[PDB]
Amino acid sequence: GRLIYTAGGYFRQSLSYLEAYNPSDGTWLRLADLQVPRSGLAGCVVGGLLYAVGGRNNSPDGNTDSSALDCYNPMTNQWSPCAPMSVPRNRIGVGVIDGHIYAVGGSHGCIHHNSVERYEPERDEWHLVAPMLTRRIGVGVAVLNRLLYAVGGFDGTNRLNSAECYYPERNEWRMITAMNTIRSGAGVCVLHNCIYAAGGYDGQDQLNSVERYDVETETWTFVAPMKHRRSALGITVHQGRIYVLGGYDGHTFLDSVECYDPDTDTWSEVTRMTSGRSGVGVAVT
């Protein structure tokens, strides 16, 4: 049995919620709160452990970006700290390769990162790798065939439709074909051997469009769009289907959760979070 876990998020302030959606029976479990309220973070899963990476603690007492790495165990329902990244990373992207966590981009105050670092869970250690060709905050990140893809984002001045690909053995980045649409804060995931970018922000509107990248053709193609435009949404894959959680539509923090079925190329609204929020970290375990 696997659940869709959402950690953290923003609604008028940063959040500590850890909630887990059961796509079968409909429930949200309330689990142990994050040690620190955090928005703009990423989630991932290595060895069954749920990791929460980076973000920002934006509480009514203070704004601080976070370099933190924290670890949630469902067998104990407990959070434990990890060693932190070398720099704070708000609006981060993360991906997993060979049981290693790659932290990509994000911001620290006015710094817009191009740096990337790799976390090794068996040694609880972070190590710097080759920086991206671009500074990308609000970057989507996906792993396909052990290659690490960094998609869209915001460079501090311009929002991006470009994408680049990291080769771990050569330790270098190469630009790939760019998306059709400029997107920061899109949800980027991998499903049945294609990369999907859903929603986001082009600097003028929040997006409902969705496009998927194909490595064999090196081409992005639009698919069915979400019912709700949204930026800074959470995204995951559960049992062959894409799930988008929350986000921001320019007027309100969404609680809607949509589900994409690739076999019918349709989006459905399946559940509502216990409260609207954006900038969550989501993963399945």
UniProtKB/Swiss-Prot annotation:
Signal peptide (residue range): none
Post-translational modification: Non-enzymatic covalent modifications of reactive cysteines by electrophile metabolites inactivate the BCR(KEAP1) complex. Accumulation of fumarate promotes the formation of cysteine S-succination (S-(2-succinyl)cysteine), leading to inactivate the BCR(KEAP1) complex and promote NFE2L2/NRF2 nuclear accumulation and activation. Nitric oxide-dependent 8-Nitro-cGMP formation promotes cysteine guanylation (S-cGMP-cysteine), leading to NFE2L2/NRF2 nuclear accumulation and activation.
Outcome of substituting Y248A: Loss of interaction with NFE2L2/NRF2. Strongly reduces repression of NFE2L2/NRF2-dependent gene expression. Loss of interaction with PGAM5. Abolishes interaction with SQSTM1/p62
Impact upon substituting G106C: In a lung adenocarcinoma patient; somatic mutation; strongly reduces interaction with NFE2L2/NRF2 and reduces repression of NFE2L2/NRF2-dependent gene expression
Effect of F154A: Abolishes repression of NFE2L2/NRF2-dependent gene expression
Site features described as Sensor for electrophilic agents, chain residue numbers: C110
Tissues expressed in: Broadly expressed, with highest levels in skeletal muscle.
Coiled coil regions in record: none
Stated consequence of mutating Y201A: Loss of interaction with NFE2L2/NRF2. Strongly reduces repression of NFE2L2/NRF2-dependent gene expression. Abolishes interaction with SQSTM1/p62
Compartments, as annotated in UniProt: Cytoplasm; Nucleus
Superkingdom of origin organism: Eukaryota
Kelch repeat copies, ranges: 3-48, 49-99, 100-146, 147-193, 194-240, 241-285
S-cGMP-cysteine found at: C110
Function recorded in the entry: Substrate-specific adapter of a BCR (BTB-CUL3-RBX1) E3 ubiquitin ligase complex that regulates the response to oxidative stress by targeting NFE2L2/NRF2 for ubiquitination. KEAP1 acts as a key sensor of oxidative and electrophilic stress: in normal conditions, the BCR(KEAP1) complex mediates ubiquitination and degradation of NFE2L2/NRF2, a transcription factor regulating expression of many cytoprotective genes.
Domain notes: KEAP1 contains reactive cysteine residues that act as sensors for endogenously produced and exogenously encountered small molecules, which react with sulfhydryl groups and modify the cysteine sensors, leading to impair ability of the BCR(KEAP1) complex to ubiquitinate target proteins. The Kelch repeats mediate interaction with NFE2L2/NRF2, BPTF and PGAM5.
Protein name (database record): Kelch-like ECH-associated protein 1
Gene: KEAP1
